[PDB]
Design a protein around this ligand. Structure first.
Ligand code: GTP
Ligand code: GDP
Ligand code: MG
Lengths: 430, 49, 67, 430, 46, 8, 46
């Protein structure tokens, strides 16, 4: 019951999913052949959340994979746990977008999306009670940031009451791999605010910083960043698949973390994270988890959370632990940092406890906090956008496929209005 | 009268400064384990050392 | 802004949110009155897609003419 | 020929119902399978041959807790189709559980209530348990109380609500639905007992000497209080008290029926037997402000009426000799228009111990239910918390979009202001 | 479906075009009896 | 330790 | 004079109170014919 379907688009989203599904399968004891080989009874009670049942007793994820080029899905199939995905759900084009948002949203993405919407509708109509959808995509690419966001609007138009999740990677100015990143980032943020019920920003720069400083491993690769993102993704829905002292589905988090409908851009972090050589030194206790949870360097975004004030915060503890300690520590982390918490909403931290810890760990915490410090990312994105747009650089590529500069002006104005009205509440006082 | 007027004018600043510094000291007494009551935490947070 | 905020400030605290929503909405016709576009009262590719859909439909209609 | 029906709604309600139903089964000698290997009739019913069925119903929209109940050791006890379960949780939204999803479930609950009531012949009244700071709990409790008040009329209903702590909180939006639910049960419930978690945490820490308590330890104390309250209906005693003999002794006026409880002694077996536990010392400990079961200071207000239950080998003359001492003390003062304010009950059955629990076995115990003027502080602080966020209309869109009108928030505020004025008007001397 | 829409959405989906047209002419004509003129205009719009 | 009045 | 006031000031000084009153009842009653009800309401206000 109350299950969700998985939809991913683009190369970055496909690579994120290729590790997210591996993590989920390892958590539920599903072999790469789709056969259950788990140890505990609880591993099968709520498997309908992510997995479907077919004849022969094997399980198949309800994931939908889409891209405008076939290479990435032809590569993910040969990887581990690549056989679980149903071949029918693979939809792809023969041309690609070339990191051009217009091509992936107006000319090419519009004709292809009917086929993927057909299978999306097939998956949603069938399921017992829908909880919602979760979306993984990147804002630094053309086909992803175009087709995914248009699909968001199409899904929202047909299921207005369901919940919608988006895990979005925004292009940081530090590690830049594409010159046309500001254009399709700014165009995508315009559409994303209007339809997504929840959005979670993730930055490659913050992932590299975490890998270099906390884990202290010499050579980070995309596999480590994907693993961290996958652990963070799994931590959110853990209590929906396992029993606990205070169950809290996604809708309950939506109620408690979004004060106003347009303020739904969160930054997350996962604890504990320790190096291989120091994993024996540390002792896992609730104070040790909560001190690392609110650490500024532990956030999955380069945004500095002590440059603003938290509107609200959430924590999803895992493992068996006493609730009194959790509540007193949450109170203590809020009394010692009163300057960084907005004062006109008292008791702005939500807590939840799940009795099933991750495989290999005795305690774990997932942190989701809505803070005013996120304005800095939109500020720098808009700064680069307006630095590049004033000369009409690279504009002809977009304008040759039916798009105009008016949609750029409206997007810039709406993004600046969002930036302004997000900080409006930072200076608000009672 | 002039000091009381100034203290009223700047009361919001003085109260922000008071609240900012009143919880910055390391008191071993109020380490989270032995503060049995919310009232004791509230009383400590209302004092500056 | 002005004149509409002083009018919203004359409405009791229970209905002030509704009056603020009505004032934002009243901001809605005014822009149209000020300007002239009946599509600002809520919340390459577009043109091309519309054109293509119309053309296909037109061909079907042509087929209806053909019928 | 005397019966009572207990209603459990929400996660907290179900988790305290489990706690009370181990205790009752243990106290009446019934095994967890429901089989005995004439006092049971108050809580149970005979099936003709063999097992006993509790006169209780479990309600929740979120299925995890009920599924946990239906697989534990008590799977054979409860009737399979009185554990009503939903599919979608209200997610801490009060408007959801009062207007959207609770209405489709409330009819089945009312049918079950009728089917249980037709069996009873001497129905004393109803008991209801619900944690107030949640969507489904508060909303469904309000709707059930409103339906029962008109279906049955003058039958007595008792509510063991758990209000949020002064500063410790798990959610961020619980003041809104707490205020709305207080509005709903102010004109619909005959008795309401205060049960916030912080006071019981302090009790456990100081007396039981547990530094890491969980919810089970709290629920066991609540279960002991319930057993002490209802012992007089199913055991022989020198001075009996019935449920219907409350509004004539503790409720001076129809509006004022919120009172706070205390229990004594609370002590562990490691140091219980070193002291004699006389009746005088336990009745002194029960009146200590630090042993209140709700975090309120009785020294800040007058007393109106005290109803306090004993059980064990206590002799009435020793009780009178201790009531005199309390009347003597200068730190406890009663209201002017109440010369005598004590109602005393004496029972012979000593409290029963649960194996593996915290409390030890003792021959004397005292449970007090006291109505005092000092309770207005919790209302004032909840009102202050509510006003801070209602000034900017925060989180209101999550309620307006679930069918509730805009003006519904204001009238709850007006009723709380009326209640606070009434409490001040009553406490002044003539 | 107007009965299901919120108050603000209800007005914009029920009397949006009529109010815009009536107020537009009202501001342009500035009649001595704006209420009477607007009332008749609404009935004539239908 | 001063209260807020002692701090003023 | 209303004719000299800007569009915003003109509406707020000419039809602000009437529109707010009509919208208030419109959102509370949610009639099937909001436009017709509002039009009659304006004429009745005078
Ligand atoms: N004393 C006590 N309080 C609890 C317990 N569990 C939850 N609560 C309280 O209940 C409040 C929230 O309501 P819950 O009972 O957890 O959830 P709910 O009533 O089912 O409402 P939903 O969130 O919609 O499911 C929290 O603030 C807790 O303080 C418990 O086991 N014992
Ligand atoms: N975490 C992670 N990020 C990736 C990976 N591959 C690419 N990216 C990011 O995705 C961005 C490029 O997106 P792109 O591949 O063009 O998306 P597409 O246009 O939808 O195919 C780069 O800035 C990378 O930082 C990966 O395997 N893992
Ligand atoms: Mg619940």
């Amino acid at each position: 019951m109350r299950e969700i379907v998985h939809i991913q688009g683009g190369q970055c989203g496909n690579q994120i999913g290729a590790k997210f599904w591996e993590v989920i399968s390892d958590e539920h004891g599903i072999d790469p052949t789709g056969t259950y080989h788990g140890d505990s009874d609880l591993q099968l009670e709520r498997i309908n959340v992510y997995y479907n049942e077919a004849t022969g007793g094997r399980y198949v994820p309800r994931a939908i994979l889409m891209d405008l080029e076939p290479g990435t899905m032809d590569s993910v199939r040969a990887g581990p746990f690549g056989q679980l995905f149903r071949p029918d759900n693979f939809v792809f084009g023969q041309t690609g977008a070339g990191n051009n948002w217009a091509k992936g949203h107006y000319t090419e993405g519009a004709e292809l999306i009917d086929s993927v919407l057909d299978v999306v509708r097939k998956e949603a109509e069938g399921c017992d009670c829908l909880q919602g959808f979760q979306i993984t995509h990147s804002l630094g690419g053309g086909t992803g940031s175009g087709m995914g966001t248009l699909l968001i609007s199409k899904v929202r138009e047909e299921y207005p009451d369901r919940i919608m999740e988006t895990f979005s990677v925004v292009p940081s100015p530090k590690v830049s791999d594409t010159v046309v990143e500001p254009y399709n980032a700014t165009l995508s943020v315009h559409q994303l605010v209007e339809n997504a019920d929840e959005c979670m920003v993730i930055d490659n720069e913050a992932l590299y910083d975490i890998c270099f400083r906390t884990l202290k491993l010499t050579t980070p690769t995309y596999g480590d960043l994907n693993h961290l993102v996958s652990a963070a993704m799994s931590g959110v829905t853990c209590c929906l698949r396992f029993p606990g002292q205070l169950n809290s589905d996604l809708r309950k988090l939506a109620v408690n973390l979004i004060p106003f409908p347009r303020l739904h851009f969160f930054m997350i972090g996962f604890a504990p994270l320790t190096s291989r050589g120091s994993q024996q030194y540390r002792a896992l206790t609730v104070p040790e988890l909560t001190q690392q949870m609110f650490d500024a360097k532990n956030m999955m975004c380069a945004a500095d959370p002590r440059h603003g004030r938290y509107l609200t915060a959430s924590a999803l503890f895992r493992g068996r632990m006493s609730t009194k300690e959790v509540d007193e520590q949450m109170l203590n982390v809020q009394n010692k940092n009163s300057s960084y918490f907005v004062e006109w909403i008292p008791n702005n931290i939500k807590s939840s406890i799940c009795d099933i810890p991750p495989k290999g760990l005795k305690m774990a915490v997932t942190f989701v906090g809505n803070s005013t410090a996120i304005q800095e990312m939109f500020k720098r994105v808009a700064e680069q956008f307006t630095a590049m747009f004033r000369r009409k650089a690279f504009l002809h590529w977009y304008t040759g496929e039916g798009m105009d500069e008016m949609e750029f002006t409206e997007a810039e104005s709406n993004m600046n209005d969002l930036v302004s009205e997000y900080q409006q509440y930072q200076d608000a006082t009672a | 009268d002039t000091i009381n007027i100034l203290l009223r004018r700047y009361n919001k600043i003085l109260k922000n400064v008071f609240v900012k510094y009143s919880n910055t000291g390391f008191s071993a007494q109020f380490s989270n384990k032995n503060v049995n009551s919310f009232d004791a935490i509230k009383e400590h947070n209302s004092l500056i050392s | 802004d002005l004149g509409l905020k002083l009018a919203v400030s004359t409405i009791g605290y229970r209905d002030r949110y509704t009056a603020e929503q009505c004032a934002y909405c009243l901001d809605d016709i005014i822009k149209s009155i000020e300007t002239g576009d009946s599509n600002q009262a809520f919340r390459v590719i577009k043109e091309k897609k519309k054109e293509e859909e119309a053309q296909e439909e037109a061909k079907k209609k042509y087929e209806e003419k053909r019928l | 020929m005397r019966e009572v029906i207990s209603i459990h709604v929400g996660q907290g309600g179900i988790q305290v119902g489990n706690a009370c139903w181990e205790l009752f089964c243990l106290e009446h000698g019934i095994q967890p399978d429901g089989q005995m290997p004439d006092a049971f009739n108050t809580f149970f019913s005979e099936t003709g041959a063999g097992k006993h069925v509790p006169r209780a119903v479990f309600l929740d929209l979120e299925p995890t807790v009920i599924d946990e109940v239906r697989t534990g050791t008590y799977r054979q006890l409860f009737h399979p189709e009185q554990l009503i379960s939903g599919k979608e949780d209200a997610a801490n939204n009060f408007a959801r559980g009062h207007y959207t999803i609770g209405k489709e479930i409330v009819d089945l609950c009312l049918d079950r209530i009728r089917k249980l009531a037709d069996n009873c012949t001497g129905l004393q009244g109803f008991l209801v348990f619900n944690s107030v700071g949640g969507g489904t709990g508060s909303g469904l409790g309000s709707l059930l109380l409103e339906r029962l008040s008109v279906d049955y009329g003058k039958k007595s209903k008792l509510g063991f609500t758990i209000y949020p702590s002064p500063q410790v909180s798990t959610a961020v939006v619980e003041p809104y639905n707490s205020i709305l639910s207080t509005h709903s049960l102010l004109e619909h419930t005959d008795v309401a007992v205060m049960l916030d978690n912080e006071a019981i945490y302090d009790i456990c820490r100081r007396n039981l000497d547990i530094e890491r308590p969980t919810y089970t330890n709290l629920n066991r104390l609540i279960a002991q209080v319930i057993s002490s309250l209802t012992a007089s209906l199913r055991f022989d005693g020198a001075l009996n008290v019935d449920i219907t003999e409350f509004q004539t002794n503790l409720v001076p006026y129809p509006r004022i029926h919120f009172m706070l409880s205390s229990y004594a002694p609370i002590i562990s077996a490691e140091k219980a037997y070193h002291e004699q536990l006389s009746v005088a010392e336990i009745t002194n400990s029960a009146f200590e402000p630090a042993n209140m079961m709700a975090k309120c200071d009785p020294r800040h207000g007058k007393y109106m009426a005290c109803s306090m239950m004993y059980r064990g080998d206590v002799v009435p003359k020793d009780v009178n000799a201790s009531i005199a001492t309390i009347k003597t003390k200068r730190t406890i003062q009663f209201v002017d228009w109440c010369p005598t304010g004590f109602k005393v009950g004496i029972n012979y059955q000593p409290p029963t111990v649960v194996p593996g629990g915290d409390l030890a076995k003792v021959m004397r115990a005292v449970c007090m239910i006291s109505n005092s003027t000092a309770i207005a502080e919790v209302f004032s602080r909840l009102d202050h918390k509510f006003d801070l966020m209602y000034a900017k209309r925060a989180f209101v869109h999550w309620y307006v979009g679930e069918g509730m009108e805009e003006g519904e928030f204001s009238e709850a505020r007006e009723d709380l202001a009326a209640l606070e004025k009434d409490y001040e008007e009553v406490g002044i001397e003539t | 479906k107007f009965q299901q829409l919120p108050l603000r959405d209800y007005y914009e989906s029920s009397v949006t075009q009529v109010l815009l047209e009536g107020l537009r002419e009202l501001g342009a004509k500035r009649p001595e009896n704006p209420i009477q003129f607007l009332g008749k205009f609404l009935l004539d719009r239908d | 330790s001063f209260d807020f009045q002692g701090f003023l």
